Every structure is written in structure tokens, then in C-alpha cells.
Amino acid sequence: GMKTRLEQVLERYLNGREVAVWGVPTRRLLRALKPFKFHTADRVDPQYHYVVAVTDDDLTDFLSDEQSKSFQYANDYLTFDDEGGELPFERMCFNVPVGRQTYFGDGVVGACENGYIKSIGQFTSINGTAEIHANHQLNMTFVSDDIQNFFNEESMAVFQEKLRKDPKHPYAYSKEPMTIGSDVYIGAHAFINASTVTSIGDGAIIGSGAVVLENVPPFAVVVGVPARIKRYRFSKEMIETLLRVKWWDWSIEEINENVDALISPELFMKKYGS
Amino acid sequence: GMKTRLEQVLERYLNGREVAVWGVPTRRLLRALKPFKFHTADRVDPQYHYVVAVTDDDLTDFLSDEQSKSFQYANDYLTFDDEGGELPFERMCFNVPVGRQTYFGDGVVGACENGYIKSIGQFTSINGTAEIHANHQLNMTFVSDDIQNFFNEESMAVFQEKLRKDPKHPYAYSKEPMTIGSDVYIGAHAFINASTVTSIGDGAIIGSGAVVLENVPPFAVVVGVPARIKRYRFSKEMIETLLRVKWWDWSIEEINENVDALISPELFMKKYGSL
Amino acid sequence: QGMKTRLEQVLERYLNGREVAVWGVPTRRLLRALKPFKFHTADRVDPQYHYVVAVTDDDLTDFLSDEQSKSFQYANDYLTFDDEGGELPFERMCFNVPVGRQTYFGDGVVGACENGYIKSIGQFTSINGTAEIHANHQLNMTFVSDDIQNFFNEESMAVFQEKLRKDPKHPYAYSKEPMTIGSDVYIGAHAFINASTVTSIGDGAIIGSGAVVLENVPPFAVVVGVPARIKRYRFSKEMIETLLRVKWWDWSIEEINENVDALISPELFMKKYGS
Ligand SMILES: CC(C)(COP(=O)(O)OP(=O)(O)OC[C@H]1O[C@@H](n2cnc3c(N)ncnc32)[C@H](O)[C@@H]1OP(=O)(O)O)[C@@H](O)C(=O)NCCC(=O)NCCS
Ligand SMILES: CC(C)(COP(=O)(O)OP(=O)(O)OC[C@H]1O[C@@H](n2cnc3c(N)ncnc32)[C@H](O)[C@@H]1OP(=O)(O)O)[C@@H](O)C(=O)NCCC(=O)NCCS
Ligand SMILES: CC(C)(COP(=O)(O)OP(=O)(O)OC[C@H]1O[C@@H](n2cnc3c(N)ncnc32)[C@H](O)[C@@H]1OP(=O)(O)O)[C@@H](O)C(=O)NCCC(=O)NCCS
Ligand SMILES: NC[C@H]1O[C@H](O[C@H]2[C@H](O)[C@@H](O[C@H]3O[C@H](CO)[C@@H](O)[C@H](N)[C@H]3O)[C@H](N)C[C@@H]2N)[C@H](N)[C@@H](O)[C@@H]1O
Ligand SMILES: NC[C@H]1O[C@H](O[C@H]2[C@H](O)[C@@H](O[C@H]3O[C@H](CO)[C@@H](O)[C@H](N)[C@H]3O)[C@H](N)C[C@@H]2N)[C@H](N)[C@@H](O)[C@@H]1O
Ligand SMILES: NC[C@H]1O[C@H](O[C@H]2[C@H](O)[C@@H](O[C@H]3O[C@H](CO)[C@@H](O)[C@H](N)[C@H]3O)[C@H](N)C[C@@H]2N)[C@H](N)[C@@H](O)[C@@H]1O
């Protein structure tokens, strides 16, 4: 129903080639490949073939073969098992928009599937171990969720009605899915609570181990259990300039023309601050 | 003979059907499928077939397939590679009893296999990243465990004898394996120390990131590194009542008959006000 | 790669001209490692003629529960293909990284060896599989992303690398030594060590579960917390000094067994080696 990462890349780049499967195929992979022509990879030529590596180990083996030298990433090959891997173009993850050059792990892929995330910006870097989950209801006698597997139609109706009016947003009910900005960095073993967080601002840094229970302002650096603001990456004038310029939506050419201002915040302020 | 999750479900529900394997069969699967007829899934019909998706992606595929619309969870299908998934009936994980509708990840599966856990309650929800490990010996010149691979039988015997006497339970020696109660909730990146914890009480909530180094009282809410008690979910009076009522052992029929009391603590204390 | 996997180094050392019997579903990567050898799908296996390679841990568990495994000895006659961080009875390489005997860690630390963040990991060291070791990205530019560099032309890349190599805060662990992780070190679950700011986890160090380690851990220090702080040292300053000279973790196997009384009892260790 919803285009996988691989499905989006093939639409964009397969360009009528056949798919050369590198590695042991899976049922999920074969279903995704039914509309196209595909075969077990043997001799591969990027004029004729698109290489799908099934697992990361498959990709590792393929990138080690001399036959891969003529294949360029995403344009001519991809890994099937890496829904959170970044791409050179804006993509969808389970109906969540994800910007260019943004990566995350299966925890966040799940959070996208669970409806917890509104979007993830560009050039955002999320450690694979990050976790994003909602709270369960905290205003009933039980805290379990799978208890509802035992609920009949009537029990489940009252259960849902009280979830729906709970202002603490159990299961992120009746709140906005959170936006994760562009140029965000999230370190290892971090948690973001989907019941109380709607906003991880542009440029925000979430340090390793941080348990993030409330919104992170743009370009704030938060650490600790629970996450506290340690510092801001830039002055407020530089932050508001960054929020107006939005360099993370710049074209590739634009990124290179102004590389100097991207590596020097001082020149960035100088060029764009007024 | 320690039975997988899948074997326990097949024993209960297969009901003379044939197993239809949805996905690539692994050796762990074929060892588990030994007492049953099975084939590679092609056309399936829950009248003659119980479908075993091997991986999570296999189940995703199967459930995306139109042949699945007639298959009920656990009754007619299961994922083999999810030893921690919840079930509608009480089960074993490495001979550790697990209540109904309780789920957890591979780390807690590993804890069951390592012998760290006596039992896990009903309607308990444990994030898949939770870790439960014991301490190594802390009173020896060395802290390694795998050094013992180099011990000969006599060396190993003195090593084991000191371990068995250690009051601080390295490798959880000489202590009770821990209980995890019912209606327990454990967040992401949590840790429970198997050497120093014997019980996660009924109804406890363990916050994300919490490092749990001592017993968590029933219905306590613990957070932090290390975990400390921020509050209890219910009054002192309600906790005693809950511990007597034990709704988590109720029948499905009782859960629906008394759902009003499950949904409102206020009503629960009226209904069970005089025990 | 140019570089030998753990399995490649084990076969080189012990295969001894035998055929490889594959226990489990082979992978394309495994089949490439096995290419120069005669190999086959494990049916009946005999350690005189076969070396068993289990593909996954699940396969290893299966093999070791099969009666056919009784004759096979760890590493000498069988290994797991996909356990690059597992322990070995001899010192080995993980990518460019020396790793001592009976030392294990998980894929996070494997990745850290591949990234260039680790100089060496000592002997008899135990690292929980969830441990993470990563560096900081640049903190003195307009952006913090790394994959933005996938868009850099050659000129853009050059000014980017130029500034990075001048940064005294070591983004991507630039301009610093890769960290050494000592011998007889213990690292608990959900621990993090910052490769930008740490160059040394001393011998004997204990890093507790949940710790965020932002600076060097002295030898035999016990550190906990976010950020990690020293709770105690395992031994007195004089025994630490004695341990760092004796380096029992470099001892041979017979030495370990002859001196097991000193390894078990720090007090006897001291009377013997402390001068
Ligand atoms: C936040 C981060 C990116 C860099 O911030 P920084 O500028 O280096 O911060 P500093 O080193 O100046 O630290 C300043 C203060 O913040 C604290 N601090 C910084 N990072 C912290 C963290 N992750 N946890 C707890 N405290 C932290 C320091 O203890 C110090 O405290 P003090 O000021 O009270 O003495 C880094 O610490 C981090 O977490 N990077 C993650 C790397 C990683 O996880 N690897 C891969 C994941 S993708
Ligand atoms: C603990 C939890 C259940 C909610 O409890 P709560 O009482 O609503 O928490 P509140 O934020 O309202 O306030 C509780 C107090 O403890 C703190 N706190 C709450 N949760 C915390 C956590 N996980 N870690 C650290 N501190 C926490 C709050 O900051 C506040 O502290 P204060 O007294 O010093 O101001 C929830 O925050 C949580 O941790 N859920 C984890 C979600 C998850 O990981 N899911 C996976 C499982 S499948
Ligand atoms: C660090 C550790 C080894 C125990 O050390 P210890 O010498 O027993 O220290 P204790 O727990 O008795 O107490 C030391 C103090 O530090 C605190 N502390 C100890 N370990 C801590 C941890 N991991 N996190 C936070 N705080 C901790 C204690 O609360 C205690 O209180 P105090 O400072 O107020 O006195 C242990 O706690 C640990 O982390 N084990 C690892 C389990 C694991 O994850 N295993 C899998 C790996 S393969
Ligand atoms: N190699 C060194 C670099 O590694 C990390 O960044 C990497 C990610 O690791 C990688 O992600 C992949 O691996 C993750 C971890 O397993 C998975 O979650 C994810 N789905 C998967 O695509 C992205 N593709 C590319 C990105 N630059 C660090 N942040 C970075 O500082 C470090 O320099
Ligand atoms: N989907 C949305 C729900 O997700 C989580 O609950 C889920 C579990 O995640 C899932 O678990 C599975 O996935 C885990 C994560 O990989 C594995 O560890 C585990 N072994 C595996 O069975 C259980 N089967 C069903 C349970 N209700 C949240 N707690 C809940 O708030 C949220 O509403
Ligand atoms: N079984 C119980 C023992 O378990 C852990 O020690 C084990 C490691 O778990 C294991 O590691 C393996 O599993 C890890 C977890 O997935 C992977 O990261 C790793 N790559 C993989 O080789 C090593 N081989 C052996 C070591 N003794 C505890 N530390 C120890 O106190 C406990 O007694």
C-alpha cells in the first residue's frame, strides 16, 4: 500500500533495466520485484542491470566485487533491508517525508510506521539505536496495551473513548505527530517520548543517552536523563537567520556555490544576517 | 527438551493441520518442526494449514497477501523468530512462565535462557531494547568471565566455589531468579541488574533509560540512572486492593464483565472497596 | 576486504586441510570466504574430516544441541560466521584492531573498529553487545550533518576536510589517537564512549550500565552515570601499580592455572607479586 524505500528508488532510477538480486532473496523482496524482470545476480552491467543487495552483508560482498566499480549508489544499486538509510533525494518512510542525506535505524522506521513522526528534515543524522515511543494510558487501573486484544466490541469502545479525551496523549492520541528538523544530530541510546514531544527543532543536537521528554528548540543542545538544554549552537540572531535562509533546502549546485558560508558560520551571518 | 514459542502454539492450536512455512526455513525452525507435517507455503487455507512466517518480514509479506485475510493470529499463524511476542495464553520462554498478552525483546529472551528470570506476569509490556544481566565477580583480582575457558577442572572448581559463597550474587548465583510482575511497563534503554534485583513488583513502570539496581515496589514509577522512585500509580490503599484482586489473572469474560473497573480506578475502589 | 574476518583468521589457523561443513543457510558473503576451500552442506560431520561453520548464532545453538557436536571443540573445529565480535582463545584482528584472548563485544564495537576509533582491545575483556562507540561530528560549522558531504564536489570536499583536520575537538576522531580499551575491562549494557574525547579505557576499568563516558577512564576505575564519574577503584593504588607491572592478562594458560589462587584472591596476589 505504501511505497518502500527500494520501491521509490526503482521508480526513479531503474529506467527499464532488469534487477540483479545480489544475495538470497526473501518473500518480501520477491513481492516487491514481481512487476519488474529480475534474476539472480551473476555478471552485472549497469547499462542493463540494477543491483539490489538483500542484506547489508550482501551489499558488503557486492561492493567488494570488481563488477561493482561501475555501479553508483542509488542510481544503480541499493540495499533492500535499510528503510532508514539515506538517499540523495527526498523520500517517504511509511508516509513520513524524509529529507535528503538523512539516516536512522529500525527504531525510527517503526516510529514512522506507528504514526509518531510528521516529517524528518534534510541532512539529519540519527544513531541507529534511537528509540521513539509513546506513553501508555496513565489514568486507568491498567497500563498494558495488549490487554485490549481481550476486549470485546463494547469494552474496546469505552477504552478508546477515554483514550481519545486523555490530554496526556496516550499512544500519541489527539496530538500532532512530531516534526524532526533538518541538520539534527541524535546520538546513541537516545529516547524521545512521542506523547509529550511534537517538535525537535532544526539544528537540534540530542546527546548520547538523552531521554527527551519535551520539545527541543531549534539549535539547542540537550543532554542527560531527563534531557536538559546544555547550550545553543548559535546566537539567537544566527538561529533566526538560519530559520529564514533554510540552507538545507538548497540545491546541490547551491550547496557547493556557498560551501564557504556552510563551513564558516561567521561568513554565513555576514552574508545572510541582514 | 525446552520448547520454542512456536512449538507451544502448535501443540495448542495446530489441531491436526499441516504447517505451511512462509519464508526460508532455518535449522532452528526445522528442529522445532520435527514432530509435525509441514511444507513450503503456496496456496494456503486455514482449514488445512497453519502458516508459520519465519521472520518478521515474512509475516509482513504474508499479511499483505490476500490469502491471509482469513487467518487469525496464534490460532492459525505465528512468526517463528519472535520468542518474546505476546500470546493469548500463558506460555514458557526457556522454561520461564510468561503471562498472557506479555511481550518483550531478545535481550529478555536471553535473560530467560540465562536463568535470570523466575517468571513474567500477565499484560506486561517490555520495550525490546531492555537488558537484564548480572554482575561478574567483584571480589577477585579479575572481572572477566571468559577467562574461565582457560581454567582447568581444578582451577574451575576453586573459581566456582568462591562464586557460590559470594553474598553479592555474581552471575546471579545463590539468589532467587527475579520475578517481573503483571501490568508492568518498561521503557526503552532500560536495564535491570540480575545480581541485585529479585522482583519488579506488579504494576511497576520503569522509565526509558532507567538503570534499575534494586527491587521496584509494586506500582512504583522509577526513573533515572540509577533508577529512583518518582511516584506510585495509585494510593497505598488501592495497591493493597489490587494485590488481592489480581485482575491480571481474570478470565477474558471477567475482563469484559468488569471493564468499567479496569478503565476507572475510582470505580475499582468502589467495586472492590470491601474485600 | 583487504582485511581478514575473524572467521578467515580462524580457518587459516585451524582448518588444517579439512572440508568445511556449513550448518545453516549459506550467505553470499560466507560463500566468498569459503571459495578456496572444499565445502558442503553439513549432513554427517566428523571433526577428523570437517570443520563446522554455523552461519548464525541460531545455527550455532542448533549445532551444539545436536549430538554430532560432542566431538567438536570451539574454534579448533567450529566457529560462527556472523559473530565478528565473539571471543577467541588466541589474539586476533578485528579490522586493523588487535583484540586479546577471551575478549568479546557486539556489532557496535565491531563497527567502531572498522571506523578507526579503536587502537586495540585488551585480553579478558567483556563488552555488552549494546555498547556504542561513536565520535562527534564537527561542531564549529554551520551544519552538523556528515552525509551532506555526499553532495560535495572535489573543491567543496577539500575546504571541508581542511577545516576538519584543524579542529582540536577531534570530529570523526580526526587528529587524535584511536582509543585503547585495556585488559580485564567490563562494560555494561547501553553504555556509550565518545570517540572524539576519549583515548583510553584503562586496564581493569568497569563502565557501568547506562554510563555515558566522555573522558578517559583510569585503570581499574569503576565509572557510572550520565556523564560517567568514578565511584571507586577496584584496588588500592599499590595493587593497581602491581597489576600494571605483572600484566597477568598476558599470561599463558598454564601460568593462569598455576597462579589461579592469586587470580581468585587479590590478597594473595599482593603477598606474591607486590614486593
Ligand atoms: C553533544 C555532543 C554531540 C557534543 O557536545 P560538546 O560540545 O562536545 O559538549 P562539551 O564536551 O562542551 O560538554 C559540556 C558539558 O556538557 C556535558 N555533556 C556533553 N555531552 C553530554 C552527554 N551526551 N551526556 C551528558 N552530559 C553531556 C558535559 O559533561 C559538560 O558538562 P559540564 O559543562 O557540566 O561540565 C556529544 O557529547 C555527543 O553526544 N555526541 C554523540 C556521538 C555519538 O553518539 N556517536 C554516534 C551517534 S550518531
Ligand atoms: C515514566 C513514564 C512512564 C511517565 O511517567 P510520568 O509520571 O507521566 O512522568 P512526568 O513527565 O509526568 O513527570 C515525572 C517526573 O519524573 C521525570 N521523568 C519522567 N519520566 C522519566 C524518564 N523516562 N526518565 C527520567 N525522568 C523521567 C519527569 O521529568 C518528572 O521529574 P521531576 O519530578 O524531577 O520534575 C514515561 O515518561 C516513560 O518513561 N515512558 C517510556 C516510553 C518507552 O520507552 N516505551 C517503550 C516500551 S514498549
Ligand atoms: C557497576 C557495577 C559493575 C556494580 O558496581 P558496584 O561496585 O556493585 O557498586 P554498587 O552498585 O554496589 O554501588 C555504587 C554506587 O554507585 C551507584 N551505581 C552503581 N552502579 C551503577 C550504574 N550502572 N548506574 C548508575 N549508578 C550506579 C549505586 O547506586 C551506588 O550508590 P551510591 O553511589 O549512592 O553509594 C554494576 O552496577 C553494573 O553496571 N553491571 C553491569 C550489568 C550489565 O549490563 N551486563 C551486561 C554485559 S555483557
Ligand atoms: N561509518 C562512519 C559514520 O557512521 C555513522 O553515520 C553513518 C550511518 O551509520 C549509516 O547508517 C547505516 O547504519 C546505521 C547504523 O547501523 C543504520 O541504523 C542505518 N540504517 C544504516 O543505513 C548511514 N548510512 C551513513 C552515515 N554516515 C556516524 N553517524 C558517522 O558519524 C560516522 O562517521
Ligand atoms: N505497534 C504499536 C505498539 O508498539 C509497542 O507494542 C507492541 C510491541 O512492540 C510488539 O512487539 C514486537 O516488536 C517488538 C519491537 O521490535 C519486539 O521486541 C517484540 N518481540 C515483538 O513482538 C508486540 N508484539 C505488540 C505490542 N503491542 C508499544 N509498546 C505500544 O505502545 C505501541 O502501541
Ligand atoms: N550467557 C551469559 C553470559 O552472557 C554474557 O557474556 C557472553 C556474551 O554474551 C557472548 O557474546 C555473544 O553474545 C553477545 C550478545 O548478543 C554478542 O554481542 C557477542 N557478539 C556474542 O559473541 C560471548 N560470546 C560470551 C560471553 N560470556 C554476559 N556478559 C555474562 O555475564 C553472562 O554470564
Ligand SMILES: [Cl-]
Ligand atoms: Cl491460559
